[PDB]
Amino acid sequence: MIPQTLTNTNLFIDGVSFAGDVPSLTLPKLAVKTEQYRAGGMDAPVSIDMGLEAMEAKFSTNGARREALNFFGLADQSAFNGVFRGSFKGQKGASVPVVATLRGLLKEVDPGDWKAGEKAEFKYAVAVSYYKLEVDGREVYEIDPVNGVRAINGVDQLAGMRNDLGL
Amino acid sequence: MIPQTLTNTNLFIDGVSFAGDVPSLTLPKLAVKTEQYRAGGMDAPVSIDMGLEAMEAKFSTNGARREALNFFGLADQSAFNGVFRGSFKGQKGASVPVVATLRGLLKEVDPGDWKAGEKAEFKYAVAVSYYKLEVDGREVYEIDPVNGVRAINGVDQLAGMRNDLGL
Amino acid sequence: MIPQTLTNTNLFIDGVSFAGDVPSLTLPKLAVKTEQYRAGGMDAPVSIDMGLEAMEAKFSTNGARREALNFFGLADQSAFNGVFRGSFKGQKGASVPVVATLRGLLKEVDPGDWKAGEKAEFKYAVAVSYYKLEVDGREVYEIDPVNGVRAINGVDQLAGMRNDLGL
Amino acid sequence: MIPQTLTNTNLFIDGVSFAGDVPSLTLPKLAVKTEQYRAGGMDAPVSIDMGLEAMEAKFSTNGARREALNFFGLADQSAFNGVFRGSFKGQKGASVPVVATLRGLLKEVDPGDWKAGEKAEFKYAVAVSYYKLEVDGREVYEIDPVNGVRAINGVDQLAGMRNDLGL
Amino acid sequence: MIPQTLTNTNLFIDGVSFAGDVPSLTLPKLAVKTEQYRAGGMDAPVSIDMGLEAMEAKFSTNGARREALNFFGLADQSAFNGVFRGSFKGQKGASVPVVATLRGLLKEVDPGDWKAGEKAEFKYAVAVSYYKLEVDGREVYEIDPVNGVRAINGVDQLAGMRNDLGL
Amino acid sequence: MIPQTLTNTNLFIDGVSFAGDVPSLTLPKLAVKTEQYRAGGMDAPVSIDMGLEAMEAKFSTNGARREALNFFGLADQSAFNGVFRGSFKGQKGASVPVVATLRGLLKEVDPGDWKAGEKAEFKYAVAVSYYKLEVDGREVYEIDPVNGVRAINGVDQLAGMRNDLGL
Amino acid sequence: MIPQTLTNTNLFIDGVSFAGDVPSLTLPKLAVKTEQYRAGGMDAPVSIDMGLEAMEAKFSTNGARREALNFFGLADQSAFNGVFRGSFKGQKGASVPVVATLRGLLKEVDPGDWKAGEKAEFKYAVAVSYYKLEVDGREVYEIDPVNGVRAINGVDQLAGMRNDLGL
Amino acid sequence: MIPQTLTNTNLFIDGVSFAGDVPSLTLPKLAVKTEQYRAGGMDAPVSIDMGLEAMEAKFSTNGARREALNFFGLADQSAFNGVFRGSFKGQKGASVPVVATLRGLLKEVDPGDWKAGEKAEFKYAVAVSYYKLEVDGREVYEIDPVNGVRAINGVDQLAGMRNDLGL
Amino acid sequence: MIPQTLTNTNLFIDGVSFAGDVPSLTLPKLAVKTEQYRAGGMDAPVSIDMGLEAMEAKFSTNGARREALNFFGLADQSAFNGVFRGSFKGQKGASVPVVATLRGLLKEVDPGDWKAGEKAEFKYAVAVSYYKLEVDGREVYEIDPVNGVRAINGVDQLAGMRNDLGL
Amino acid sequence: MIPQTLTNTNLFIDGVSFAGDVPSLTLPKLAVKTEQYRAGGMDAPVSIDMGLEAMEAKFSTNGARREALNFFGLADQSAFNGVFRGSFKGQKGASVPVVATLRGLLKEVDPGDWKAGEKAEFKYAVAVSYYKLEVDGREVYEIDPVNGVRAINGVDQLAGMRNDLGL
Amino acid sequence: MIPQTLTNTNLFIDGVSFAGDVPSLTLPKLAVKTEQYRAGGMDAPVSIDMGLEAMEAKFSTNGARREALNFFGLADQSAFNGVFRGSFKGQKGASVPVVATLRGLLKEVDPGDWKAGEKAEFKYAVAVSYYKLEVDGREVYEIDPVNGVRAINGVDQLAGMRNDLGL
Amino acid sequence: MIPQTLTNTNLFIDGVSFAGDVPSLTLPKLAVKTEQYRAGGMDAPVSIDMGLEAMEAKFSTNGARREALNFFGLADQSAFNGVFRGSFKGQKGASVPVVATLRGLLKEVDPGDWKAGEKAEFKYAVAVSYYKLEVDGREVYEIDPVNGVRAINGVDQLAGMRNDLGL
């Protein structure tokens, strides 16, 4: 119960600050692989959580930022680290930091149309292999796909699966 | 026969009020699985009610509302409760409350593009496993898919199906 | 040879007047299942009338109109009656009533985005099982799919089919 | 020399009309037992008419139509009567009735997969012991296998065989 | 070599003039069934004329014009006659009449959204079984699909096909 | 003469309800061992009813339903009971129960491909040693193979055979 | 060396034109009874021409065309005459007629599934006892199986066989 | 290195000038059938030139230009000649003529919506069977598909193919 | 009576975890050698349990997993152990482990088509000589073919056979 | 080590060029009659070369190409000559001619379904009695079955067989 | 951490400067063929780098630039060289050159609609067979697909692949 | 426990690299001749290893690769050597070489349909007489059929057979 939204952002990659060239910043969309499930004895289908969808982050630059141009197509996937920061200010004089540590693959580099008097707008896309979202210094999520972590507030929801499969 | 429409809204999740951060609120669309049916002796197809479609609610926030960010991807589906409220005011000085109790899965979390001076606009989607719509304190609907309830004004339309299938 | 168009409308359901809450009214589209037919000895295909398409009416409300919210998903299909009225006024001071009696299924209920200061705009859709259109008090059409009626000005075009099939 | 095809159908069994539940209707395929015949003095084989193949009709229902469910496996073969009707409409406003009186055995009852929100689609098959096809009220064929009738336009083609065999 | 375009139009159906209610008039699009043909010894494909596409005219009314509402879905296809007229005026004071006699099926009737203070805009579509276009009183085209006519300036281009097929 | 089809289903085994896990339900196909019979003096073969074919039911589950996993390969054949229920709803508000009591052998258990994010889809097959189909509470069939029952509407068609063979 | 293909077709039977109802037309496939022959002193088998295969034409109708429905199963084989015509148009404005006179047996009549709003598609098959193919008014082939004719451009290839066998 | 672009255009067909009615003129798009080719030993796919795509020109008129209305659907494909002219003026006082001789089929005639006070806008499309583009009086291209010409500045790139295939 | 299905899997061989490379996992199909049995005095055949069919498991890898590539074709059959694990999660927050201990022969290794930018998809097949299925830590089955065990819930159904044969 | 593939083709028969009508061209498949051979002292079978399989070429036309329609069923087998040409262009500007001289029997002529607005697609098949494949003007193969030639790069592999058999 | 973007551009082809006619310049998009990979023991899919996607550059001209009009469809693919230059100026007085040497195929030439008083806007597309991007005189990337180079800052990421495949 | 799959491939034959023309590469399938064995005292059959199946490799080219076209049908079987290489890259920056040395017979050469603008796709098949698979430089398998070798990790599983048979 208070107005609040984004006011400013910033991007870190390999400790390098892009405070100055992140026009668009995108936190990877989160979804589950809902399988609409209808069986006998039930009229209306119910969705079932059958795991997460593929994550994909995105962030853009307007200049030839050789840092994060040199992380495309590396053989060492998951070497592309990253931190998405966002400053959420309420109505009142209070600021909520939001942090999304990423680690994965710089999937794509898509230089837009160079129109000779218009912004370059390099679009990137990242295929995420690790996702930790923090709000106000507190863990909200932590995915680790390959290790089987899906944590909510520090509670791994997948502990039962890990027990069933024996890691 | 009176003008009337929405004037203001509010969202409750787990008793927490979001009176202040619900720019877009969406009641789940309702449909039936009409199978266009044409047989011999009839020129034009007739639709047949073969059950309901999948429900999906949606609601959005602009700030890192840790409540309802921490209900994504939980193992305990249907733990995501929810109440969609809407205040319908007529022309004259009268107000009609509309309430849609929900219970299901927080299917999706889709943080929009962070553009550094624009609203964050976190989009969520909910896969609904229970739907009770009330208007002016009176039951309009109640779905319970897994138990086989499709009630209109308190009249379970599926009672014949439940008798035929023996629960 | 006179200008003329719609000026105002109204909706009846179960004798209840919605004179006041029908922003959009839609008469069900009418089509035939034309099968583009080309055979030997003819260069260009000719369409063949192989029956009608599925009908679908639509009408919307902005308030929680409990009448016609309580006709969704009823087991008794074709209990959803309905009358679409439209007042066509010419250039000169004359008014032509257009009436489309409907009877079928309230197929769908789709509450739009509740944006907290914008109209609700409940979208409905109806799967029609009976369609009688009247203009100026005169029968233009009457479909009855299940009985095999497709009348034009009172002339059942399907009488030959009914004779061939023996009802 | 006119476009024409099927527009609508209907099924009668024991005088009961299934005007409403015949999604697929199949007239029994007709063939002769061609024996590809090659002899001395001829390069290319010629087919010889050595009688008809087995007939088999088919028709389907989507509901538990107790009429024609209760004609399976009866001891009294040929008690399963039947009339396949089809309304062939030309391009112009003319309708040609096609009628295939059948009489034989309800050979098979094959309820399809009940998928809980999909049509039932009971498939039947009929082993035919009598076949009279009529077009526009005129006899086209009449088979009577056991009596040795194969009539074309009222002309029993098997009269020579009946004379040779002495009935 | 002179500026020229459409200035005004009119529609006749069954001799009835709609001088007053034809907001949109559409002459049926004409195309050939080009099969992009590439063979050995040729690099680039060449299109081949393999006959015409299906024709479809369209015209709209804003009032309940009972004439041409009563020609939908008639059993007698090709009873829907029609004349599309268009007055092409040059720069100089000269007017070129364009006439497209049509005859076919009123395929479709699609009453637009009745918005209570907006034009009705009944959309129709016609499946054409005969097309004669005239410009300045002179035959430009004449299709007759079922008889195998595709005339240009009175020259049936299909005469060779008619000779080959023997009508 | 009314539209009607399946809307929902359910399965009972040993009184246990699987209202919730029967994606596909299959009633055993019914056929007779038609021997296409051609003799002297008849041109076209006639099928003869020489008894029924082997029955086989099928039903599937997506979870490890230990009930009906523990009925495979039991020494006591015919201990696998079962009830296939199906709710056939007409167009109008009426529901027709269909019941197929089964008793036989759980012939087969075929766990589909486990694809790590897709339904399990355990396929079963049942070899039926008893089949009673009921529609709307009325006996349609009753097979009892080993006792020699083939009843239609309560009329054992095999009574003549039982008399001839002396039980 | 010119593009060319089929553009339109037509069928004659007993002088009756089916210019209007021949969706699919099939000229009988031609083959020889190649016996793959390998002997001593040769590594790879060579095919030997040991006569022709059985011919079979096919053509279909969508309406109850009583002409060519009344030629099935006639005692007088080879009374079913027939002419398959095809208009082959090149790229340039030239048309090549192709004609296949047939004479044989209407082997088969296979009415497809009547689906109540879909084409009937009567499939026929013809067992051919005479085959003359003409292109551009010139004899390409003439088979006469029973008389021992296999002519190419008017040259009976079987004259040596006829001499050897003495007719 | 000089500014330059289109300033004015014109169309010739059969020597007739349409200096006055060519609002939109389109030179046929040119492409090659690139097959994205990836093999062993190479990470990234390389496109391969496997011939040209289908060409299609377009040009429009607003009046009933009987010339080029009378070239649709002619049996003599490639009788539709044509010359697309365009005057490219630089910054300085110099003009570069661009000429695209065409020859092919007037594929399509698509009269737009006649809206009674709006331009007619007849859209045409041409299927091209010959394409010679000239700039400043010099040959840039010449396709001749059927003869196997793809010339650049007078150099047939397909000479090797013609040698390999022996014309 | 609860929704439930597979969400994730894992494979163990010789204690080595393939948590990361099991795209497809297949539990061996289970069947009995039903001999359709018909005798005198019974119309319809009854299936008889005459033992189990051959078992065959399958599992696939996309990388050269030297573990389980080195168990093919070993002289010591039944040295190929194995554990198929599957995590079945219900609707609610509960997880059911399913375990199938296997022991037999790695029958087959079938590397799919290596397409240079597509998954390798090594297909394996296992010929099973021992099968214990467990659900939720409880024995469902245990086959031991060579020792004559077919246990259901710990009850050897073959004890009578072992007594009859004296081990 | 260079990308390369087919770009265009052509067919010669009796010196006549079909540059324009060879949509599909097929070089005859080559195989050996491998007899999977397993003997004592060897675990795994080894294939043995026991001669070639039967060859069969194929090529198709869409028009009534009287040349190569008049070579079917000739008494003089091996009079059907033929040259299959194919232009293989690399990535770089180089073209590799591939030539397969054929000589054998036009085995089969299979006119596809004439669908009245679709390509004719005459399928042929050739039974080959001589096969010389050349690449870039160099002999790759030469079969002569009846003379016992199987040459690779001019080296008759069958010379030992010819010596053993004395021609 | 400094504002920076594109201010001006230029194109070189074959050493010819188009300083004056490059309205739109496009550097080829870079991506990897991510295969979303999910296996056992992991909830969420991880993308895998399986090589690069097809590259495609684009650049446009408004005048008939005979240079780079004469490089379309050349037999010698990779003869189309090219240099994309872009001047990135920061906030402060500093300029960063960006250079993308290209070499491949001028895939496509697409002259836009010539509207008689609007820019011509010739669109080209290039299929790239070599890509070296340089920023500030330093190598950022170098692809060479056919040789297997994917260099980052001079470090060939594909050296392991080249070792594994032996070039 | 790491994601990994194929990324790129290559083929060597006689030391010649086909780095550039191996669209599909197939390692020979490996199986054993399992004889499903059931005896007295055992309910369920057990498979027995009775030796290996026939091996068959496959690899394809799109150009006339005279190397490996000139190894078909050679008298000297097992002169066709070969090395199948595959680069398996994990998630992390590591590459696993897989090598399958082959030696046998080029069994088959099957040039696909040459469609004049589509890849040639020469399919080959190899009958293998020697198979050594290596992963990461380590011997996984070595078959030598004729010498009786079936090695796993350097351990000849057939040593007992060789002792029993005395070589």
Side-chain angles (χ1 to χ4, degrees), chain H residues 46 49-50 161 164-166, chain J residues 6 8-9 12 85 89 95 97:
Chain H
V46 175
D49 186 359
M50 294 176 71
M161 182 180 74
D164 293 331
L165 296 174
Chain J
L6 182 63
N8 191 2
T9 186
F12 292 166
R85 293 182 184 271
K89 182 175 73 176
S95 180

Side-chain angles (χ1 to χ4, degrees), chain H residues 5-86:
Chain H
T5 187
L6 182 63
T7 61
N8 191 2
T9 186
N10 190 0
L11 181 63
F12 292 166
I13 296 169
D14 191 74
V16 176
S17 178
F18 292 166
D21 192 359
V22 297
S24 178
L25 184 65
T26 302
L27 187 64
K29 182 175 74 175
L30 294 173
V32 299
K33 186 180 288 294
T34 59
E35 183 65 26
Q36 294 178 355
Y37 182 74
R38 184 176 178 180
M42 63 183 285
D43 186 74
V46 175
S47 293
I48 297 169
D49 186 359
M50 294 176 71
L52 294 174
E53 292 292 328
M55 294 182 286
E56 182 182 0
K58 292 181 181 179
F59 64 94
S60 65
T61 61
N62 289 317
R65 296 290 184 271
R66 185 180 67 191
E67 293 82 4
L69 291 171
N70 60 3
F71 290 167
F72 185 73
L74 294 174
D76 190 359
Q77 184 174 0
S78 298
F80 181 77
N81 61 3
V83 177
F84 293 171
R85 293 182 183 271

Side-chain angles (χ1 to χ4, degrees), chain D residues 35-164:
Chain D
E35 183 65 26
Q36 294 178 355
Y37 182 74
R38 184 176 178 180
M42 63 183 285
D43 186 75
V46 175
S47 293
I48 297 169
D49 186 359
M50 294 176 71
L52 294 174
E53 292 292 328
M55 294 182 286
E56 182 182 0
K58 292 181 181 179
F59 64 94
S60 65
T61 61
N62 289 317
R65 296 290 184 271
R66 185 180 67 191
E67 293 82 4
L69 291 171
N70 60 3
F71 290 167
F72 185 73
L74 294 174
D76 190 359
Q77 184 174 0
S78 298
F80 181 77
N81 61 3
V83 177
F84 293 171
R85 293 182 184 272
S87 178
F88 291 168
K89 182 175 73 176
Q91 184 179 3
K92 293 181 181 179
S95 180
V96 175
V98 175
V99 176
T101 302
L102 294 174
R103 186 179 295 276
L105 183 62
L106 182 63
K107 181 173 75 174
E108 184 177 359
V109 175
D110 187 1
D113 293 331
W114 292 353
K115 292 181 181 180
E118 295 295 328
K119 292 182 183 181
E121 186 65 26
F122 292 167
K123 298 292 185 185
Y124 298 163
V126 176
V128 176
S129 67
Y130 182 76
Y131 181 75
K132 182 175 73 174
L133 182 64
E134 293 179 352
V135 176
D136 190 73
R138 292 179 179 92
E139 183 180 2
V140 177
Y141 300 162
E142 184 180 0
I143 300 168
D144 190 356
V146 298
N147 289 318
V149 177
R150 184 180 67 189
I152 302 298
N153 291 320
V155 176
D156 189 358
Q157 296 294 321
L158 294 175
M161 182 180 74
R162 294 179 67 188
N163 290 318
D164 293 331

Side-chain angles (χ1 to χ4, degrees), chain E:
Chain E
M1 293 182 286
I2 190 166
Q4 184 179 2
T5 187
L6 182 63
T7 61
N8 191 1
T9 186
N10 190 0
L11 181 63
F12 292 166
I13 296 169
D14 191 74
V16 176
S17 178
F18 292 166
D21 192 359
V22 297
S24 178
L25 184 65
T26 302
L27 187 64
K29 182 175 74 175
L30 294 173
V32 299
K33 186 180 288 294
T34 59
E35 183 65 26
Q36 294 178 355
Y37 182 74
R38 184 176 178 180
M42 63 183 285
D43 186 75
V46 175
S47 293
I48 297 169
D49 186 359
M50 294 176 71
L52 295 174
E53 292 292 328
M55 294 182 286
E56 182 182 0
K58 292 181 181 179
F59 64 94
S60 65
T61 61
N62 289 317
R65 296 290 184 271
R66 185 180 67 191
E67 293 82 4
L69 291 171
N70 60 3
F71 290 167
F72 185 73
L74 294 174
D76 190 359
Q77 184 174 0
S78 298
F80 181 77
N81 61 3
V83 177
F84 293 171
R85 293 182 184 271
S87 178
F88 291 168
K89 182 175 73 176
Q91 184 179 3
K92 293 181 181 179
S95 180
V96 175
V98 175
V99 176
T101 302
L102 294 174
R103 186 179 295 276
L105 183 62
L106 182 63
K107 181 173 75 174
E108 184 177 359
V109 175
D110 187 1
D113 293 331
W114 292 353
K115 292 181 181 180
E118 295 295 328
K119 292 182 183 181
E121 186 65 26
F122 292 167
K123 298 292 185 185
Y124 298 163
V126 176
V128 176
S129 67
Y130 182 76
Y131 181 76
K132 182 175 73 174
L133 182 64
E134 293 179 352
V135 176
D136 190 73
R138 292 179 179 92
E139 183 180 2
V140 177
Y141 300 162
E142 184 180 0
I143 300 168
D144 190 356
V146 298
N147 289 318
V149 177
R150 184 180 67 189
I152 302 298
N153 291 320
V155 176
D156 189 358
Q157 296 294 321
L158 294 175
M161 182 179 74
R162 294 179 67 188
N163 290 318
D164 293 331
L165 296 174
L167 295 174

